[PDB]
Every structure is written in structure tokens, then in C-alpha cells.
Write a protein that binds this DNA or RNA. Structure first.
Lengths: 45, 44
DNA sequence: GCGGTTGCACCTTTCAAA
DNA sequence: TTTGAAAGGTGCAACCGCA
């Protein structure tokens, strides 16, 4: 049900501060980041 | 550093494995990079 | 140790079966 | 109505190959 990503503290810090601004969890944020990146890769030519 | 879990369904994990392969990187690398690009998008 | 990866254990919120 | 499984969330422990 999960994958794991090894992050350092600074990146974890940025994720949390960014997620709070947009009224979402860090977890939601990472998933959306993944969906957005995959669409770019899949829509590329 | 620590490992952060992400709840991903099977279709999404295969989309990742497939995209990772055709850019010559690991699934781990793709997720990390996804995170960094998305933070750049938010912060810009 | 870092990148890559597995596998878990506990938390909170949501919401239909009982 | 209650209640616990499912969904969404979080992060610890430890494997590998590597350098």
C-alpha cells in the first residue's frame, strides 16, 4: 500500500511549510507532486 | 534523514515504475524529483 | 551514510454496515 | 445510533550495494 522516500530534514521542513500554506497535509503534497510529475513524463513526446 | 511513506495504489506504483524505466532512474529518484519540482512550482 | 527499498505500526478522519 | 474498517497520514528500523 506504500512506497517510501528518504528525505533530509530541510526538505521535510519545506514540505511542511508549503503544505500548511495550501491547507493540505505533507502526505497529500507528496502525492500531488508525484501525479504532477508523472503527467509531465506521460504527456512528453 | 528519514523515510517518509506515501500511500499509493497499484496503478500509480506501476505508472511510476514505467516512467522511471523510460527516464533511466529509480522509482525512488522519480518521487524525490517530483517533490523538488512541485516545491519549486509552489514557491515560485 | 546515502540512495534505494521494504515493511511495518501507530495515528486521525470519514462514513456505511450492522 | 454505534463502531470499526477504510482512507488518509506519519515516520521508525533495517536490509542492500556502494564509495
Amino acid at each position: 500500500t506504500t512506497m517510501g522516500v528518504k528525505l533530509d530534514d530541510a526538505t521535510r521542513e519545506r514540505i511542511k511549510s508549503a503544505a500548511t500554506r495550501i491547507d493540505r497535509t505533507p502526505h497529500w503534497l507528496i502525492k500531488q507532486a508525484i501525479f504532477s510529475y508523472l503527467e509531465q513524463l506521460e504527456n512528453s513526446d
